[PDB]
Amino acid sequence: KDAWEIPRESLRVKLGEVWMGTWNGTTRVAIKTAQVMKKLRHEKLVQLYAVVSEEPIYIVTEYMSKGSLLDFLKGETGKYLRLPQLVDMAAQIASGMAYVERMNYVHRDLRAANILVGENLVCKVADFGLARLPIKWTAPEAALYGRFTIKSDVWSFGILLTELTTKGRVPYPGMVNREVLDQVERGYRMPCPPECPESLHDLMCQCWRKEPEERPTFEYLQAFLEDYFTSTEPQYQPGENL
Amino acid sequence: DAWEIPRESLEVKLGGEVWMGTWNGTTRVAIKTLAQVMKKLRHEKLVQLYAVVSEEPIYIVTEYMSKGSLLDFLKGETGKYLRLPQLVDMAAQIASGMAYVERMNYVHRDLRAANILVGENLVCKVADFPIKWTAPEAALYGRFTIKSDVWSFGILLTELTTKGRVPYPGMVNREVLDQVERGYRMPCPPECPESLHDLMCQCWRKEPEERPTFEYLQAFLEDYFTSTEPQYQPGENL
Ligand SMILES: C#CCNC(=O)c1cc(Nc2cc(C3CC3)[nH]n2)nc(N2CCN(C(=O)c3ccc(O[S+](=O)=O)cc3)CC2)n1
Ligand SMILES: C#CCNC(=O)c1cc(Nc2cc(C3CC3)[nH]n2)nc(N2CCN(C(=O)c3ccc(O[S+](=O)=O)cc3)CC2)n1
């Protein structure tokens, strides 16, 4: 064992198998019941508090109040979410992934389901169970050949942008996995979502490139979305949904 | 108007009379012997009106649905093999029809399995235009709105998940009126996911305004097995 190890009795309501418990009677934690979540440490990544190595293996992390990003968009709160908040959340995710990027790691499962919302629309990347150094979300070179890179996470980020601009609607509506695999290889890309700016949709298609090394880095993705409503879309005005 | 047709071209009696026949010798139709609203409403998930005979004897010609009603289809021999994936799919198709009704500012006032028809490839459409099905604010005070059709949709989800069993088993209309108003809701039916049952209780809110729209209901059922229940596995009944 190591320094991350804690006794199984040191930590004291179900959520979805992750529970909301209490660590040392003063810390609000979350317990999910590598050595990859330990090394990675960023404000936009869900922080690991402690680990249990005895059966059953526990994972003690920080607590996010608003839950999953997918539930948050589909939920009652998500219908008032406009583009300024949505691009801001995308920027927060792209911030953590940029950290993951320069750390030379791969997430291999970047999607709204694995992103948690907290107070003040704070979004953090979670679940590094497949992390190393979902076909509708996965890059084709990874869903076929197992070529998982940071540029395969950019593809998923491109898919993620559709979930945000549609409030959590499943990518490629009406299509099944084998139907997606066939269409994507043929060049089919998801069209510009209703009331979504083309500059944002262009960024999607850039994340959806046949050539992995032609997809832009998360450092670019972060900078593009953070400076969005000034450099790219300063003429923006509110609509019915976006 | 312009919906009129010559009295040509009835073959068999389906089930005020309902017949399966032919129109103009080529197209298969459903003749109802013996309104003005079915002329305005057009949607792929609403039973489409074809033609009308205005003078007595009155005759209504709509599209034909082969599997009869959704209620008979569930209780019947085919409903025996119906699993939840196909059941949530049928519920999504209906919600789509009611979402059209919703954005057209209309009310159905009788959303139930008896008033929903099934065709080939498990296609379900709303038709026609019952205290166990209708909302209490509509049953007592007469407040029929689209959010009162959402209540019925909540009841509709029970029929689907129980193969068409009458809601509130062992209870009469007097029992239902009092219990529901007392806060009583139907429990989670056997082998039915609690997420789906939560959606039922949403459609069964006391305040009509807090009940979700059919635009929401449609999306929740369509993305159900990816967003809401990804780890679903087949059972004996559901
Ligand atoms: C609004 C409101 C109330 N809040 C919640 O209802 C609420 C709060 C929360 N806060 C948390 C948890 C964590 C810990 C890193 C988890 N940090 N902050 N999390 C969740 N959800 C539920 C749905 N979820 C799942 O179903 C799942 C996915 C993968 C998974 O893989 S794992 O390898 O076993 C096993 C479970 C994921 C978490 N839900
Ligand atoms: C499996 C199998 C064989 N299929 C059928 O046995 C079969 C097929 C069908 N297909 C249809 C009908 C329609 C038209 C809307 C009728 N489109 N597609 N309909 C029915 N029916 C439903 C309804 N039934 C009624 O009796 C009634 C309805 C309203 C009504 O109100 S109206 O204002 O008078 C007064 C009576 C009785 C069986 N039954």
- Which value, in Å, is the radius of gyration of the alpha carbons in chain A? 18
Q: Distance (Å, rounded) from C-alpha A73 to C-alpha A85?
A: 12
Show residues of chain A in contact with B227, CB under 8 Å.
Answer: 70, 74, 113, 168, 170
Residue B160 DSSP code: H
Query: Which experiment gave this structure?
Result: X-ray
What's the CATH superfamily of B12-63? Phosphorylase Kinase; domain 1 (3.30.200.20)
Give CATH 3.30.200.20 domain extents, chain A.
18-62
Residue A5 DSSP code: B
List, in sequence order, every residue forming a beta bridge with B62; answer none if it has no partner: B30, B49
Contacts of B53 (CB under 8 A, 6+ apart): B4, B5, B7, B59, B60, B61
Strand order in the sheet with B17-23: B12-13, B17-23, B27-33, B59-63, B49-53
Q: Distance (Å, rounded) from C-alpha A150 to C-alpha A7?
A: 35
Q: Are B82 and B163 in contact (CB under 8 A)?
A: yes
Q: Distance (Å, rounded) from C-alpha A219 to C-alpha A98?
A: 5
State how beta strands A59-62 and A28-32 pair.
antiparallel
Give CATH 1.10.510.10 domain extents, chain B.
70-225
Give CATH 1.10.510.10 domain extents, chain A.
67-229
A64: amino acid identity, one letter: M
Show residues of chain A in contact with B220, CB under 8 Å.
Answer: 74
Closest C-alpha among B122, B126, B127, B129 to residue B66: B122
Residue A35 DSSP code: -
Q: Distance (Å, rounded) from C-alpha B133 to C-alpha B154?
A: 9
| Residue B49 near ligand 2, beta carbon < 6 Å | no
Q: Residue A224 has which token pair?
A: 């593009």
Strand residue runs (E) in chain B: 12-13, 17-23, 27-33, 49-53, 59-63, 116-118, 124-126
Q: Distance (Å, rounded) from C-alpha B215 to C-alpha A217?
A: 37
B211: amino acid identity, one letter: R
Q: Are B61 and B9 in contact (CB under 8 A)?
A: no
Which residue, chain included where needed, has tokens 């792929």?
Answer: B44
Which residue, chain included where needed, has tokens 């459903």?
Answer: B30
B188: amino acid identity, one letter: C
Q: Are A157 and A123 in contact (CB under 8 A)?
A: no
- Residue A109 annotated as catalytic: yes
Closest C-alpha among A58, A62, A54 to residue A20: A62
Q: Distance (Å, rounded) from C-alpha B123 to C-alpha B119?
A: 5
| Residue B12 near ligand 2, beta carbon < 6 Å | no
Closest C-alpha among A103, A93, A102 to residue A124: A93
Give CATH 3.30.200.20 domain extents, chain B.
12-63
Where b means 16+ CB within 10 Å and e means fewer, A45-62 reads bbebbbbbeeeeebbbbb
Q: Are B47 and B125 in contact (CB under 8 A)?
A: yes
The third-level CATH classification (topology) of the domain covering A18-62 is Phosphorylase Kinase; domain 1 (3.30.200)
Closest C-alpha among B60, B71, B48 to residue B17: B60
Ligand 2 pocket test: pick from B11, B12, B18 the residue with the most ligand atoms within 8 Å of its Cβ.
B18
Say whether A106 sits in a helix, a strand or coil: strand
CATH 3.30.710.10 for domain A67-229: no
CA A6 to chain CA centroid, nearest Å: 28
The third-level CATH classification (topology) of the domain covering B70-225 is Transferase(Phosphotransferase); domain 1 (1.10.510)
Give the annotated binding-site residues of B for ATP. 14-18, 32
| Residue A193 near chain B (CB below 8 Å) | no
Quote the ligand 1 centre to B21 CA distance (angstroms): 56
Q: Residue B69 has which token pair?
A: 């009603």
